[PDB]
Design a protein around this ligand. Structure first.
Ligand SMILES: Nc1ncnc2c1ncn2[C@@H]1O[C@H](CSCC[C@H](N)C(=O)O)[C@@H](O)[C@H]1O
Ligand SMILES: O=c1[nH]cnc2c(O)cc(-c3ccc(F)cc3)cc12
Ligand SMILES: [Mg+2]
Length: 213
């Protein structure tokens, strides 16, 4: 019995099938009352919700699925026919995320890709039929944020206006990524100060909009 299985079982027993809002509320209750987990959370999730409503992305890429919290969160706001691709290196988590999405009834909007982002990003054009991305949510491992941003650019997956949204730019913190996008004339950056999920600890999200070569 892992924490991630306990979160899924809690949702299965305390949320309504096909209601993504009740799924998000059950995860937030479990993680506030029972066991902390590294879901984006309601505080930062509200900022994500606002950004998704602004840009109404047709194709979103998420790096780091975990239990599926942010996937449900973004997927429930996507337009009919819009898609999310989420990459998850840990197969146990991949499987928890698939079941989470199935229960929320969002499985037809989301494809979970198994593997390291650094292995799958180069496969997106040919293996997964991707042209360019409208939005990327970076929330996997801090040390991958900058190399994966640079890899997405190299692979031609970024276009003018592509919205990169990065979780945890303050805690655990992504200093090289932040220094890079903020100093780069290829990105327009905005910081959204907030709180670490379920904690009274300052964190934030960085929005960096790609401006071209
Ligand atoms: N290189 C990599 N590629 C893909 N996934 C990775 C990765 N390094 C870490 N991960 C995964 O990223 C996750 C971090 S937690 C992700 C939280 C999720 N976005 C949410 O808010 O609900 C973990 O599940 C971990 O397995
Ligand atoms: O490693 C992480 N990947 C993605 N998101 C995370 C996230 O939101 C929080 C944390 C985290 C924060 C504080 C702490 F004390 C221990 C872990 C890690 C990740
Ligand atoms: Mg995070």
């Amino acid at each position: 019995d892992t924490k991630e299985q306990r979160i899924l079982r809690y949702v299965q027993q305390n949320a309504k099938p096909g209601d993504p809002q009740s799924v998000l509320e059950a995860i937030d209750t479990y993680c506030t009352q029972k066991e902390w987990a590294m879901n984006v959370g309601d505080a930062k999730g509200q900022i994500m919700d606002a950004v998704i409503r602004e840009y109404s992305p047709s194709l979103v890429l998420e790096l780091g699925a975990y239990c599926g919290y942010s996937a449900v969160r973004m997927a429930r706001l996507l337009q009919p026919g819009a898609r999310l691709l989420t990459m998850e290196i840990n197969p146990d988590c991949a499987a928890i995320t698939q079941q989470m999405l199935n229960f929320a009834g969002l499985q037809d909007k989301v494809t979970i890709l198994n593997g390291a982002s650094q292995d799958l990003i180069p496969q997106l054009k040919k293996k997964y039929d991707v042209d360019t991305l409208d939005m990327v949510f970076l929330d996997h491992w801090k040390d991958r944020y900058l190399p994966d941003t640079l890899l997405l650019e190299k692979c031609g997956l970024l276009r003018k206006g592509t919205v990169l949204l990065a979780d945890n730019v303050i805690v655990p913190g992504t200093p090289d990524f932040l220094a890079y996008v903020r100093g780069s004339s290829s990105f327009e950056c905005t910081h959204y100060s907030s709180y670490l999920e379920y904690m009274k600890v300052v964190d934030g999200l960085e929005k960096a909009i790609y401006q071209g070569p």
